Design a protein around this ligand. Structure first.
Ligand SMILES: Nc1ncnc2c1ncn2COCCNS(=O)(=O)NC(=O)CCCC[C@@H]1SC[C@@H]2NC(=O)N[C@@H]21
Ligand SMILES: [Cl-]
Length: 263
């Protein structure tokens, strides 16, 4: 079935394209299986390793992490499962929130042309990559000074029945034979540019995010950490990467939470 549409990644090829002159990526490894690529890179940094510009890709992830203590389901060779290390200590802490937003924009730009784009194809705050209403990719940013580990889970041929009822994949969107080697290459290249833009506070980063946001201008219900709900209209993203809500004339700024686009 879908397994035949899932050939293995070419580590040697990815290294030839992404490592060398003109590229910031220093190290790239493809492992057959791990618990969590985010956990692994955090473990490396915890033992003194310099993970800046280091890429770890897993064909399969058995104990995937999600935001707010949730999980991330996956089957072998059905997704692009990677984590990258980013040195952030040179950047003010108030701007670290934009790093995760930049990541989702990069993931989206890497797969957007492969799709015609149906309704609801863009970014849901924080960095949910949505397509036709379904969650195409999820991003997780975890802190390990002086680094931030950026995690990306992109559904390539992953069936929604195998992971989550609200999930979608490139295959379920119409992409017949998605090449994970091509996509991963474009992903990390888009990611490199966005990280550089974030590090230098490039205005275009925020501009490109707004142009691809599905949340801004929509009536939403935001489920805050702690279990409280806030209903209003998303208006803008501030300089810290936080969602600014219009609640009956009052401005409510949210740093973290789950966004639901309402009727
Ligand atoms: N394949 C799925 N597709 C869509 N929804 C899903 C799926 N599998 C469960 N779900 C349901 O989503 C639960 C997670 N919800 S969430 O709070 O928004 N969290 C995220 O979306 C961030 C997940 C980040 C995963 C990446 S992948 C490699 C790296 N290592 C990690 O351990 N984490 C990062
Ligand atoms: Cl199917």
């Amino acid at each position: 079935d879908r397994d035949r549409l899932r050939p293995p990644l070419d580590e040697r090829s990815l290294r030839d394209q992404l490592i060398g002159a003109g590229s910031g990526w220093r190290q790239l490894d493809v492992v057959a299986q791990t618990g969590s690529t985010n956990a692994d890179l955090l473990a490396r940094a915890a033992s003194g390793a310099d993970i800046d510009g280091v890429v770890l890709i897993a064909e399969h992830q058995t104990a995937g992490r999600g935001r707010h203590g949730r999980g991330w389901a996956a089957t072998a060779r059905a997704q692009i499962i990677l984590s990258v290390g980013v040195r952030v200590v040179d950047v003010p802490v108030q701007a670290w929130g934009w790093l995760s937003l930049a990541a989702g924009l990069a993931v989206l730009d890497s797969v957007a042309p492969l799709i015609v784009p149906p309704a609801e194809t863009g970014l849901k705050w924080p960095n949910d990559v949505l397509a036709r209403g379904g969650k195409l990719a999820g991003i997780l940013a975890e802190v390990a000074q002086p680094f931030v580990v950026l995690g990306v889970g992109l559904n390539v041929t992953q069936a929604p029945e195998e992971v989550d009822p609200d999930a979608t994949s490139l295959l379920d969107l119409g992409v017949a034979a998605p090449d994970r080697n091509r996509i991963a290459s474009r992903l990390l290249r888009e990611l490199e540019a966005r990280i550089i833009q974030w590090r230098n506070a490039n205005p275009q980063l925020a501009a490109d995010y707004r142009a691809r946001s599905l949340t801004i201008g929509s009536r939403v219900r935001v489920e805050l950490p702690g279990g409280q709900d806030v209903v209003g209209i998303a208006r803008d993203i501030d300089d810290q990467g936080r969602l600014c809500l219009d609640v009956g004339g009052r401005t409510v700024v949210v740093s973290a939470g789950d966004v639901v686009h309402l009727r």
